[PDB]
C-alpha cells in the first residue's frame, strides 16, 4: 500500500513480497533438538 | 603466604603509593542518537544524497 | 464477585535473615514486570 | 475496535503532531495540500485549485502532491498520516 | 521503621486524620504541578541513590492544621481549572 511505503522509506525502502513469518520460541526456557521428521506426501495411507 | 603478606605491606611502611578503587557507575545512554536523520529537517537534495550513501 | 487485579506477582516463598520487622524481599526479574508503567516514567526522565 | 492501555498512549501520538513539524517546509508545496482537505472540505478539485494559489495550471495539481508524499519522510517522531491506510 | 511517621500520631489525638492530611493534598501536588507547594524545600525526604536526591514523598508538611476550611467539590473543581497540565513531545 501506497501510504506504508511511507514508513519504510525512513528506515531502509526495502519491502519484499514475501516475509519470515517461521514459528519463534515461546517464553521460558530453550533447548537443543532431538529428531526432525519430514512427511511430505508419502505413499502411505496417511489422513 | 605471600598473598597475606602483601595484605600487610602497607603497615610495613613501604612507598607503595596507588588508589585504591576509584570507580565511578551511573549506567546511562543516549537513545536519541537511535533516530533516523528526519529529525533534522533537511532538504530533498540531501534528503537523496545520504539515503543513497547507506545513511 | 472478583476482580482481576492489572497487576500482581506470585512466586516461591523463602526466608531472609538481612530482612527486618519492617521490610520484605522481592524476586529481582519480577519487580522490572510489576513496576513497569513505572520504571518507564523514571527512565524518560533521567539518561537512559 | 477498543485500543487497551498500552497501545492507547501511542495511537494517540500518532495523529496529532504532523502538522506542527509541517509548518516547516516550503510554503508553496506544503500549503497546497494542508489548505485543502485540513482547513476546508474535499479534496482534488483542479478547476478550482489553479485558482486557489494563483500560479502553476492543472499540470502541479498532481506534481505538488507527490513531490510532498516523499516530504512526509521528515515526520518520525511525528505522525499523523500513518494510521488511516 | 520509617521516619517521623508515629510522631504524626502522638502530636494529635487521631489516626483517622493525619491519613487525609497527607492524601487528598499529596495526591493533588502532583496532579497540580509542583508550584502550589509554597513552603521551603527543607520539608522534604531524602532518597539515596546516584549520590544525589529526587521524589519527594510527604508526611513531612503537616505542621499548621485547622478545623473547618473548604467543602469537598471544590478541592478537584478550581484545582484542575487553574492548572490543565498534560505531556507533550518535540
Known sequence: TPEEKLLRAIFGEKASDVKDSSLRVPNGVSGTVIDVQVFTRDGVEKD | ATILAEQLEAFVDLRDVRQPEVKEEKPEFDPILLRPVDDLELTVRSANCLKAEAI | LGKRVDYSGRSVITVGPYLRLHQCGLPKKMALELFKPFIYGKLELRGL | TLELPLDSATTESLRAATHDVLAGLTAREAKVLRMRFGIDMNTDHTLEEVGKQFDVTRERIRQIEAKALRKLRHPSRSEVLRSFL | ?90
Open chain 5, 1 to 90: 521503621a520509617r521516619v517521623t511517621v508515629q510522631d504524626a500520631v502522638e502530636k494529635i489525638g487521631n489516626r483517622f486524620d493525619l491519613v487525609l492530611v497527607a492524601a487528598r493534598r499529596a495526591r493533588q501536588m502532583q496532579v497540580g504541578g509542583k508550584d502550589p507547594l509554597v513552603p521551603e524545600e527543607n520539608d522534604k525526604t531524602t532518597v539515596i541513590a546516584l549520590r544525589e536526591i529526587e521524589e519527594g514523598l510527604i508526611n513531612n508538611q503537616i505542621l499548621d492544621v485547622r478545623e473547618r476550611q473548604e467543602q469537598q467539590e471544590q478541592e478537584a473543581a478550581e484545582l484542575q481549572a487553574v492548572t490543565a497540565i498534560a505531556e507533550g513531545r518535540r
